[PDB]
């Protein structure tokens, strides 16, 4: 699984690398046109590009103007993502450019390889982990900045808040993935956990609440419980029977 994957271990070496998730690029609301058929209406989307080492999230907001006059949007979205990711990389100083880009969906490989031909030293690879990055719009400050956009724009976030002052990148990425996996599993339950104590505030400049080290342990335990009970119902298994490597496989989404 993930815990015996040399690939997974590599995320936390000293190479610069970026995850790209394109799941939220093309988003719609569902309607009906005069012919009675299904009608879709694009709403703003985003590219989730993350440095798992620093927590820096380059959130490219995909304003609905970029679909105007275009067709086959579900195919185009992947090519647009690739276009933007490559533009990002071009914008960066050389020693800040990633040695590797990991796409969450294999359908991104051809479009990104083609767009990155000017960077032959940047390796594009898929992952066998089903990472929960699509749940990114369950984070209110991300959802809000995307929906309020009136034009294409890039917004930088640190998705680890101030955690790296106290824990390692591995621990912060594991925390991030746990939170997103919980929000993906059931957003209401996951929010009830995060927001149960309103005296622990989400700072204006943060995405997550200001838990103490002590409090994060409890929160992480509750998130784990939520995720594993859903898996447990899905397969009719007691949580307590799951091994630690199994739990990580569940959380990271090992194929």
């Amino acid at each position: 699984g993930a815990m015996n994957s040399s690939n997974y271990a590599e995320l936390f070496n000293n190479d610069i690398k970026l995850f790209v998730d394109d799941t939220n690029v093309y988003r719609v609301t569902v309607h009906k046109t005069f012919e009675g058929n299904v009608a879709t209406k694009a709403i703003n989307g985003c590219i989730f590009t993350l440095n798992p080492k620093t927590g820096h999230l380059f959130l490219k907001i995909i304003h609905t103007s970029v679909w105007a006059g275009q067709k086959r949007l579900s195919q185009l979205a992947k090519w647009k993502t690739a276009e933007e990711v490559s533009a990002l990389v071009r914008s960066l100083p050389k020693e800040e450019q990633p040695k590797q880009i990991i796409v969450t969906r294999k359908a991104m490989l051809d479009p990104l390889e083609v767009h990155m031909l000017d960077f032959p030293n940047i390796a594009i690879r898929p992952t066998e982990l089903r990472l929960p990055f699509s749940a990114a719009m369950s984070i209110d400050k991300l959802s809000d900045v995307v929906m309020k956009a009136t034009e294409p724009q890039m917004v930088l976030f640190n998705i680890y808040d101030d955690w790296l002052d106290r824990i390692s990148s591995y621990t912060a990425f594991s925390r991030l993935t746990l939170l997103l996996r919980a929000l993906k599993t059931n957003e209401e339950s996951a929010k009830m956990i995060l927001l149960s104590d309103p005296t622990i505030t989400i700072k204006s400049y943060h995405l997550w609440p200001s838990f103490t080290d002590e409090q994060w342990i409890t929160i992480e335990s509750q998130m784990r419980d939520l995720i594993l009970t859903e898996y447990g119902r899905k397969y009719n298994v007691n949580i307590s029977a799951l091994t630690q490597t199994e739990i990580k496989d569940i959380i990271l989404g090992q194929n």
Binding site: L76, W79, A82, E83, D110, P111, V114, H115, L117, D118
Partner: protein
């Protein structure tokens, strides 16, 4: 019809000529091959008893000269040579009169198969790939690799669908999804100059894969097929010709080698997914009849 005499045959050998083959045993008298349709290109090839030794041979054109075979005890190979003096060659051809023991190239009154397999293969196409030397004929063997394999070389035009050459900057999606720019501007207009040269290399790739077992040649053949089919815009005369070219290749392919000479991915794309799938009418028909396991 022409003759390729042998001035000696001192060593056992299995000999191929175009699609035919025969054995010459230890101490068997043998003076060559006659009744060869003049045509415009042929291959003669050789295999000795050690299965581990290479198959080697020569592509040649009877129209260009008087060619013959002679064993060379120095390199230990049958070699092709040219006789520029017509009278000396005539003497070689008629040496020994009724005592001549020769193979007759089968009559092909309605087996235009060899013509169809080599329609666009002329010696200049071959020399592009197998570097020209002092001879009017071109040596090839089963140990040769392509420059692409390398990354005695087969210098095919490199086709790479994910390369700057295939993709104009700013046309990424356009050029990856529709290969027309790459086929028409880069390959046909830029490199091959015309479709006959393109088809010639495609046919030679097939023949080398079939005769000398070179996997890189099979890769090149498939890539040149895929390039055409994955282009929305192809000159109509190419489109109409491609189906016939492939039809005879599939027809002639040794069925024992079909597993390693035929790429499932490329054929399913070309026949069922590509822009030009409807232009492969007979090729689809022969594939379905002869190799249904590939579809």
């Amino acid at each position: 019809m022409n003759t390729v005499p042998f001035t000696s045959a001192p060593i056992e050998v299995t000999i191929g000529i175009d699609q035919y083959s025969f054995n010459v045993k230890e101490n068997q008298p043998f003076h060559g091959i006659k009744d060869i349709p003049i045509g415009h290109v042929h291959v003669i090839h050789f295999q000795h008893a050690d299965n581990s030794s290479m198959r080697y041979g020569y592509w040649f054109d009877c129209r260009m000269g008087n060619f013959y075979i002679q064993y060379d005890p120095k390199d230990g190979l049958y070699k092709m040579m040219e006789e520029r003096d017509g009278a000396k060659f005539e003497n070689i051809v008629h040496n020994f009169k009724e005592r001549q023991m020769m193979v007759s190239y089968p009559k092909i009154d309605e087996d235009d198969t060899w013509y169809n397999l080599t329609e666009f293969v002329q010696m200049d196409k071959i020399r592009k790939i197998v570097r020209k030397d002092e001879n009017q004929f071109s040596y090839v063997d089963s140990s040769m690799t392509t420059v692409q394999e390398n990354e005695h070389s087969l210098n095919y035009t490199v086709i790479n669908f994910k390369s700057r050459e295939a993709i104009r900057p700013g046309h990424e999606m356009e050029d990856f999804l529709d290969k027309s720019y790459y086929l028409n501007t880069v390959m046909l207009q830029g490199i091959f100059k015309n479709s006959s040269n393109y088809f010639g290399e495609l046919q030679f790739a097939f023949l080398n894969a079939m005769f000398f077992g070179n996997y890189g040649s099979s890769l090149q053949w498939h890539a040149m097929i895929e390039l055409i089919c994955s282009s929305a815009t192809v000159p109509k005369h190419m489109l109409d010709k491609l189906d016939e070219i492939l039809y005879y290749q599939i027809k002639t392919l040794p069925e024992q080698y079909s597993d390693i000479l035929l790429n499932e991915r490329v054929w399913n794309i070309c026949l069922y997914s590509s822009f030009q799938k409807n232009s492969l009418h007979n090729t689809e028909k022969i594939m379905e009849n002869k190799y249904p396991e590939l579809l």
